[PDB]
Amino acid sequence: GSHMKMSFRWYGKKDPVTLEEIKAIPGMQGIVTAVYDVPVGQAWPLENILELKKMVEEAGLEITVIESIPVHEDIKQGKPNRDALIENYKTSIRNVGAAGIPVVCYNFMPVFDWTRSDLHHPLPDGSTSLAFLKSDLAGVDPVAIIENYRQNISEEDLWANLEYFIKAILPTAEEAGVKMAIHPDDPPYGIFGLPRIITGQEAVERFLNLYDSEHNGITMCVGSYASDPKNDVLAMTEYALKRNRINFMHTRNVTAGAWGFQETAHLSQAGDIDMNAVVKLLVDYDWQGSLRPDHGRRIWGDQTKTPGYGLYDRALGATYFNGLYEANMRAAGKTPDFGIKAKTVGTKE
């Protein structure tokens, strides 16, 4: 039976947005977070993870997803020493499973996790947002590693580097009781001479096949995949759902074409994704997992710094998914759940 927990990204103690505020989002159940006191490729201790879990649980929430045990560039490059960094990744997986967190989200995006030309590109209602203007600058070197990928490492080398990775970690994830969920490339194609392989349906199928298990699944980030129109989110969503290989949902809306892309409000008609169709799919497939609204616009006085991570519009995206999820749950004669245990504190009949 279906079981989708609303979740929200939270960067810990140093987050502009707090747990009180997050907790106040109607229907919010999960916290998506990570350890920030340890360098990339170095291995997360249990206590670190546990400190976060305690903060989150006292606030009346739970950590449902570690979003992002970062992958060291040595691993991605496929350099000689990877083995050591991978043993650290194995330790991290183990420590997350030790903490009781079911999913770990990661990426295999060489040197860049994402690219944005504009972090304040206005929208037809007064609100700013992030865009990828294919015209602007794009075609200029970002003022050792780069040339390596450019000169030496092909997409198939990256495919072989990734396969090595996932063959090395997967049994650990199995033993830990933890499911891996690879985040696609953002933008979902090669830029700056750098290669990208997690880019579309063909890529997803080849990925899942590297190690065939539920513990080896995807973060269906619909607004990344559909950043390149060449991609069709819904069949992607569905094949993945048909295969039981979606382990995390991200659900931001974006408008795209031959010209490139710009992130919009989550509403289906604000951009190019049919959001109702997405969750209708989760409904039909009795999907069990977490979804975050992912990214927001700047609206109101939102003085949250960090890119699409202001509380306000992401909140406005979550309740929109409450709507879509509840309606579709009901249309299917299913009864939706939002983790609400009490309506009131101190009254009752």
Ligand X SMILES: O=C[C@@H](O)[C@@H](O)[C@H](O)[C@H](O)CO
Find the binder of ligand X among 186, 263, 272, 302 (CB under 6 A).
186
Active-site pick, 74, 89, 295, 313: 295
Q: What are phi and psi of 256, to 5 degrees?
A: -140, 165
Distance, in Å, from the CA atom of 322 to the CA atom of 265, rounded to the nearest integer, reads 15
Catalytic-labelled residue, pool 74, 272, 294, 302:
294
Closer residue to its own copies (CB): 20 or 141: 20
Would residue 250 show up in a list of annotated catalytic residues for this protein? yes
- Our CB check for ligand X shows the closer of 186 and 302 to be 186
Q: What are phi and psi of 180, to 5 degrees?
A: -85, 145
Selected catalytic residue, list 72, 221, 302, 312 = 221
Beta bridge partner(s), residue 65: 32, 103
**113 interacts with ligand X by CB under 6 A:** yes
Which is nearest to 138 in space by CA: 182, 99, 194? 194
Binding its own copies by CB under 8 A: which of 84, 111, 133, 168? 133
Paired tokens of 213: 């298990």
Residues 6+ positions from 84 with CB-CB distance below 8 Å:
none
Of residues 125, 155, 175, 286, which one binds its own copies by CB under 8 A?
125
Instruction: Kindly tell me which of 99 and 123 has the beta carbon lying closer to its own copies.
Output: 123
303 binds its own copies (CB under 8 A): no
Query: Alpha helices of the chain — where are they, by DSSP H?
Result: 19-23, 46-58, 73-77, 82-99, 145-147, 155-176, 201-208, 222-225, 233-243, 275-284, 311-331
Residue 188: helix, strand or coil by DSSP?
Answer: coil
183 flagged as catalytic: yes
How big is the chain, counted in residues? Answer: 349
Q: Which stretch binds Mn ion (CB under 5 A): 171-179, 194-202, 205-213, 291-299?
A: 291-299
Question: Residue 68 binds which entry of its own copies, Mn ion, ligand X, none, with Cβ cut-offs from 5 to 8 Å by kind?
Answer: ligand X
Would you name the residues annotated as active-site residues? 183, 221, 250, 294-295, 309
Chain positions contacting its own copies, by CB under 8 A: 20-21, 23-27, 60, 122-127, 133, 255, 257-260, 262, 264-272, 275-277, 279-280, 297, 299-300, 311-312, 315-317, 319-328, 330-331, 336-338, 340-349
